[PDB]
Design a protein around this ligand. Structure first.
Ligand SMILES: NC(=O)c1ccc[n+]([C@@H]2O[C@H](COP(=O)([O-])OP(=O)(O)OC[C@H]3O[C@@H](n4cnc5c(N)ncnc54)[C@H](O)[C@@H]3O)[C@@H](O)[C@H]2O)c1
Ligand SMILES: NC(=O)c1ccc[n+]([C@@H]2O[C@H](COP(=O)([O-])OP(=O)(O)OC[C@H]3O[C@@H](n4cnc5c(N)ncnc54)[C@H](O)[C@@H]3O)[C@@H](O)[C@H]2O)c1
Ligand SMILES: [K+]
Ligand SMILES: [K+]
Lengths: 494, 495
């Protein structure tokens, strides 16, 4: 059985005011395994009032970064301590292979530990001097918490994506309301328990589960929420930013993508094929930065794709708890239907389904989709243009570096890309030319909390993580003082 | 001296607007038409953005080094300094600010390009900055690349300086740009085009479209090939701009309005502080975003201070901005003029006291002149206390408690700036931290240095311009992460 919880507001478990709840479904069995609170606008009001109250106390926001760091480290210890509990819940809820979930939960701890360090570095950045040319004045910078922030996250790494926002927010001195995805809210609710166990002050983090328009939208439109951190689809990001615009409320947008993986002839085919499959099929294909468009040099394309299908066919598809699982079911019935629709229109538009594109025969139940390889691609095809968010990879060949770069940048998106070539000068040339927020060289998808992360173009804007993460939650306050004790001397005294 | 007549500045040449419209230039001092400017339309926005995109796709600009771009930025500063007298004169007649104020603006324009030249060179040093990773298998660094084509939209209260705050870092970053300055004061910005050709700025790197906000500004915001908008203007326009940009999930920065508090405690030299409060609210003819327009003064010295405040104010020379000793000129236009007069009138109507001014000066019977206005007996529910007036109009209220002053000062939807006066420096810093604002002046009001970050919170917008923050607004922070192992990943089972 799974946990059963209420909303987490002001250090305590509270029932949604309208008392609606929605199903939790296991994507591996299609069965109802529990349910979660379904917050509405009334719950948002209560949660942000608590967040505002917590922000105004003398125990969090104006405290030192080192002080908040003890909490972040304690959270990291708690998570690591309760590792089995979270991994199992994440696996049951999200359908991702057990081995993937342990890395997620490992990364959650890593991220809180990383931002404890960032909270500490903050102290030394306080009253950072600004050198002015006039001896009459002095200037420095204060870095203060912005205030109450709304954090809205997706389901593909349920607790990790929440953590990418929570850790920086707390590190900065903000208080927060989290609204995780309705497709995978179990571990994020469990996180409320962790907060209470580390004695995180009441109202510092509030957790509201529910649907986007019912719990999320009121969070974005609330007069007393100073900032929104949003991760989701480009279409939703547009709505969120449009709403924020009414109150001129700042947002960050981590949105969708259709990232290319470019592969030249001078590579180790077997090493690149594994990265290619990690690039497009890992996390069951539900990666924002998934390298879902393979561009491979025509001189090695036939051999490459042959070994691609051979590795792909060796991927163990099973219940995510089965020993050796390397591909689980996609997250939901809705997603399953969308992905299957993408596959059919691909076939209808003239694409070749070279492998997969179907349900695994041995698995009667669960939203299981075979890793799918799609060839004979035209660039006008939907499957080439739009984010599928399923284990579906498109293949095109190129003749020259010139054509590789043209094809790689031929997308409205711009989150990431990967480039493979033993000529590292070539790699750098491609790297600079890619219209993208992140470039992997001779790999695809490694994600470190140390490095800034974000897209351009229709993949959104702003950078989370690394030294950039905490500054999304800061008021950069200028303070400049007249130290002369002299009259200004612009006007005439009477 | 003559007022130039100039076409749009596009792709390094002077181009008539496609629909061939022009709009008047009015001298605020005389209410008379002194000239005219191009009135760009959406059609012109399209050709400008195309030119900027083409200029970006070369590697003589976007892909070159910061040091390369810096030679142009310094060339530009030197050219502005060389033509200083010309720009000062045009800025004065066009904007309506005192000549002495315009002199400073143009000094600051040149200083700003110099500062960002330095920031362009520092950018080079920053390229490929190592990022330490825990796994010896992977190495990471950051590339700081120009975002692309940017839309830069600026207000009339410091015409060339406000434009420059955007141009200098955009170009330093390596972006190409379309500037649309205010239709109320476009002369000097258009003139900036001639400077660009004189330093050999590559065609299309900066394009200048003058015209109406809706007609020229909005199509720039909603254009599909503009990657980011840098906006300075009213909170109301800021909302429009961000709502428009949101349709394309287009990043924006917003430098909006304010209703900034000036907090004066009892331990001060009253004549020193009085000059700073008039400077804080009446300088630039009251047309300052960060204007300290809400005077919060200790009840202890309230009486004396307001008395001296009034005396200094009576002594402010109001005149045509070219007149020797001018310390207050006309507000920018008829519409602002009327707006401000209406603010004052409804303030009377709600029972506020017009202690001084509030009226058009006797000896000036044409021009948008308004006496510096001191309004007292305030309630916090009055329009004049809540809303940005943008004229030489100061509200006054007393306080007894420190916690009262803080509460009154933060009792605003805005959050741009603030000023606190106290000989007690421990008290200043305490106040500084508590104010819900992006900038705090201590024992002064309004001095603006390019070296320090600038912007607000709350309804005053978000984002920081200038200082070491200015350049970043125009960058793609690119993570580059590479596998140096040449070993199998070993996640999947090899076939
Ligand atoms: N760029 C990144 O870093 C990143 C990381 C993870 C996932 N993603 C992306 O997320 C998308 C898939 O996840 P999704 O299906 O969860 O996204 P979504 O956009 O459907 O939902 C995301 C979140 O926004 C909420 N939401 C929905 N409508 C809302 C509204 N009107 N107001 C406020 N909130 C609302 C949802 O409830 C959810 O918590 C993909 O497009 C993928 O690329 C991006
Ligand atoms: N925060 C700051 O740093 C700062 C500095 C200077 C001025 N300001 C503010 O600016 C305002 C005064 O200037 P303003 O009157 O020129 O402001 P405004 O917002 O009316 O206009 C500013 C610019 O935007 C344009 N514009 C107008 N409507 C538009 C639309 N729908 N779409 C796109 N563009 C549009 C105008 O043509 C002009 O160039 C005041 O509110 C003041 O506080 C702020
Ligand atoms: K689920
Ligand atoms: K004018």
């Amino acid at each position: 059985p799974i946990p059963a919880r209420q909303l987490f507001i002001d250090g305590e478990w509270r029932e949604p005011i309208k008392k609606n709840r929605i199903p939790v479904i296991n994507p591996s069995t299609e069965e109802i395994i529990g349910d979660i609170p379904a917050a509405t606008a009334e719950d948002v009001e209560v949660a942000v009032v608590a967040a505002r109250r917590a922000f105004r106390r003398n125990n969090w926001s104006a405290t030192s970064g080192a002080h908040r760091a003890t909490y972040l480290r304690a959270i990291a210890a708690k998570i690591t301590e309760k590792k089995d509990h979270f991994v199992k819940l994440e696996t049951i809820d999200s359908g991702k292979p057990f081995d993937e979930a342990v890395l997620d939960i490992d990364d959650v701890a890593s991220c809180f530990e990383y931002f404890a360090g960032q909270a500490e570095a903050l102290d030394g950045k306080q009253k950072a001097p600004v050198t002015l040319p006039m001896e009459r004045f002095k200037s420095h910078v204060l870095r203060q918490p912005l205030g109450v922030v709304g954090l809205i996250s997706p389901w593909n790494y349920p607790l990790l994506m929440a953590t990418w926002k929570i850790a920086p927010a707390l590190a900065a001195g903000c208080t927060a309301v989290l609204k995780p995805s309705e497709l995978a809210s179990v571990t994020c609710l469990e996180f409320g328990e962790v907060c209470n166990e580390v004695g995180l002050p009441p109202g510092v983090l509030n957790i509201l589960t529910g649907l986007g328009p019912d719990a999320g939208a009121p969070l974005v439109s609330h007069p007393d929420v100073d900032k929104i951190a949003f991760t989701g689809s480009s279409a939703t990001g547009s709505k969120v930013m449009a709403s924020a615009a009414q109150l001129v409320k700042p947002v960050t947008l981590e949105l969708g993508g259709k990232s290319p993986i470019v592969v030249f002839e001078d590579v180790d085919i077997d090493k690149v094929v594994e990265w290619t499959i990690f690039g497009c099929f890992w996390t069951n294909g539900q990666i924002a930065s998934a390298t879902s468009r393979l561009l491979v040099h025509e001189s090695i394309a036939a051999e490459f794709v042959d070994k691609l299908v051979k590795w792909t066919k060796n991927i163990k598809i099973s219940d995510p708890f089965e020993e050796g699982c390397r591909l689980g079911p996609v997250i939901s019935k809705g997603q399953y239907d969308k992905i299957m629709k993408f596959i059919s229109t691909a076939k209808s538009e003239g694409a070749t389904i070279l492998y997969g594109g179907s349900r695994p025969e041995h698995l009667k139940k669960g939203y299981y989709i075979e890793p799918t390889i799609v060839t004979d691609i035209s660039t006008s095809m939907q499957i080439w243009k739009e984010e599928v968010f399923g284990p579906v990879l498109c293949v095109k060949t190129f003749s020259s570096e010139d054509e590789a770069i043209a094809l790689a940048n031929d997308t409205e998106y711009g989150l990431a890309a990967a480039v493979f070539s033993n000529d590292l000068e070539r790699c750098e040339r491609i790297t600079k030319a890619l219209e993208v927020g992140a470039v992997w060289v001779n790999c695809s998808q490694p994600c470190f909390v140390q490095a800034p992360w974000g897209g351009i173009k229709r993949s959104g804007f702003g950078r989370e993580l690394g030294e950039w993460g905490i500054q999304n939650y800061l008021n950069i306050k200028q303070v400049t003082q007249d130290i002369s004790d002299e009259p200004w001397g612009w006007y005439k005294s009477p």
